[PDB]
Symmetry: D2
Subunit: 250 residues, 4 copies
């Protein structure tokens, strides 16, 4: 029987590449998404055409609220519903926008940035563990620049720091249940075609290894490693995939 994974925010970009790569490795996948319904269904179609009945979509808002625990539990439930098991959880979904200290309310900024980046991963991790030869693991998508943060992104940065804290705490506490917990910390990756060519090149030049952002495949390679049998002693570890960006001083 093929193991099954949940990838949050999987309809596009790095989450999509993670889902594709896990599918290519033999996983059945729950493609979770929030607003990108067309991209999600189109991805699930391509994967199921490749192998029947090995991909489903699952919609959920991961903004913090009093029903967020039930939403997270239902994402987990959808994987058991569809495939009878849940071996891997990848927490990739993330809100990302500036929140200067000096048109969303601050309440909403808090709920979106802290919810997606930290509270949802915590509640999904609860639900993952509670619901449980086997190679069980969680991979959190962290951020290699967490200690040299982007100006005015304080709530985003707080959320990613909390995610490292969850990675550690959960690796510690889920170790006796055989569940490993680790992270992948991207530097700059897959800059949106949207963004100006001059701004993208600004970021690119700073990266020592090749003066280029990471491809989505490159991030995904690190995730595949941590879920594999090749990482069975690895827990509480966070792998930077940043081309040395975090080593460059101002």
């Amino acid at each position: 029987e093929a193991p099954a994974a949940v990838v949050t925010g999987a309809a596009k970009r790095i989450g999509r590449a993670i889902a594709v790569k896990l599918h290519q490795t033999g996983y059945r996948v729950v493609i979770h998404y929030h607003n990108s319904a067309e991209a999600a269904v189109s991805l699930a179609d391509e994967l199921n055409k490749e192998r029947s009945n090995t991909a489903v979509v699952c919609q959920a808002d991961l903004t913090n609220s009093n029903v967020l625990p039930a939403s997270c539990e239902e994402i987990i439930n959808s994987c058991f519903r569809a495939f009878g098991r849940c071996d891997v959880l990848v927490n990739n979904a993330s809100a990302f926008y500036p929140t200067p200290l000096v048109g969303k309310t601050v309440e909403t900024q808090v709920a979106e940035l802290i919810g997606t980046n930290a509270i949802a991963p915590f509640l999904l991790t609860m639900s993952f563990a509670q619901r449980q030869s086997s190679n069980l693991s969680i991979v959190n998508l962290c951020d290699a620049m967490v200690d040299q943060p982007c100006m005015a992104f304080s709530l985003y940065n707080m959320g990613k720091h909390a995610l490292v804290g969850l990675t550690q705490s959960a690796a510690l506490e889920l170790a006796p249940y055989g569940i490993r917990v680790n992270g992948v910390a991207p530097g700059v990756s897959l800059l949106p075609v949207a963004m100006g060519e001059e701004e993208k090149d600004k970021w690119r030049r700073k990266v020592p290894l090749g003066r280029r952002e990471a491809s989505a495949e490159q991030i995904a390679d690190a995730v595949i490693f941590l879920v594999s049998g090749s990482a069975q002693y690895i827990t509480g570890s966070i792998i930077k995939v940043d081309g040395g960006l975090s080593l460059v001083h101002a």
Copy 2:
């Protein structure tokens, strides 16, 4: 004119020692509290008996909610209203209890532990900044955050986010001349009512004297960071833990 400080969770223990020591240095203080009303009031009395019109109290729940921004703004307002200025913020209030991954609801646990330890500090920081000399914020962190207590994952997530705020706010608020730093205790002031074997177990692991920190020892590191001797220091977290975080399993 004497500078003014807000101290959250200041009615008891480390927050109290922090308020007293700032007061002793010349600060006027806002004593924030949540449930410890008598202790907050008795402390203001004691400080005002030393120097009159130098201490007030302000009650607020710092649980995450749709009204937390406004409560935080009022905590800062209460310092301006009483004293005409606000030079220092100490983010000390903290909820602390286990939250196992496997009778409060989980959303309440989330609200309390992430609210007190991180979101409230962020909102207070925003309100403090927005209103703006030697300005500085000191956040009470945790020396054990990378070797955390089993089953305290929300508390640890909150403390990790607080370091993130410390760094981010230090970076963003530097052009205003506001420094943002942290003080990370190890074990301090273990309650009389905790187990004797339990406390002993922690105390014995502490390399520097086999004992917990007193509250005054934590307060010392705060005072230093707010002082004129810390004018170039921002984004730094001082461990005050007797070497405890250095000790392997």
Copy 3:
């Protein structure tokens, strides 16, 4: 044609496991050793029996001294001599013993512990770089417990910190040449018969992931990842392979 790797301290334990796994993936290997000549020679013999002339040995004390720079240069030389190229360097050899602050002289303690653990890795790194779809990389064997160090192992711990520094500095400096530099930080692995039973039991019991030590092959897995094509954007990273041990408080 086939890439080539230098592995230091490769005769026994983790270093041997590394050398074997690189050889299995198709590398030719220089097995460096210091005192373990019988094991080093046997290992190269076994590897050569598998694929002809794909393995050579090279002996060198990596203690710090005036001749250490030429020894390190001859080790790299030995890989170009044998195989025409040197794609991978693995810095694994390490002296390890207590040096209390309060009968080798202390200057010999310095020379051994800092030499093997830091200075030699630096000199091999220089010689590796000076000699230079290609995939060049260095992997340094670090230590997961470096911030919670063993009582009375100051010089060991100083050496390992220095190795972290090299990892970071060299990744930065060698990125423009296409050479990646990373590390792998074991927790406890392969505790020998020679070590006290009390002491061993104390360590194994503290490991969250399964209350046991890492196997050598478990450490080697992480090395193979880092040198692989699936790590092509990773440089300046250190992967803990420690079973969660470094997350456990006193």
Copy 4:
């Protein structure tokens, strides 16, 4: 009677500023130096003019060698010989120059950069402990160790090693009441002789005031760590960097 401090590389710049402040706080001091003989004696003169018999010089090369342990033991011995005691060791001396991977032999580069920045501090610390109240060591680290200067690999390796010593020695020496801590500058007191443009390049990157630290600002942090306000702080490293280490590329 007054306590005593050894300060390495104390003739000029930050070490001098540290020696001066310890002296102003009441310490007697050993001004160690290697080539700056004239500045060193000139400084001891001035300190003894203020209070007689409170300052000596001690010359030593702290390059790694088989005699380095003897030279380190002699520096501590010089403190007991002049003042009858040794309360504070400050490890400040440091070689700093590039050593690219791709006239000094590399063996000499290794010896100077690893000797001054790590091995000498380790052997000074050994000698300090064995020759033994508020006893403490302060190592001058570097806030930029994880984002290092290009081509400074032996320098960066030394400063990392020094972090590791700070930790190991805090752990091991705690049962003897010796605290071990560090101060990590960012950019401080850039050479008046270094190019203006280069200097402004670094100064512009510093969030807190777009300027380097004064030597006095670094010393303030040292002074705190040796003081009675830091009695429970060991194994801690205080960044004094104006936020420099927080700024991304």
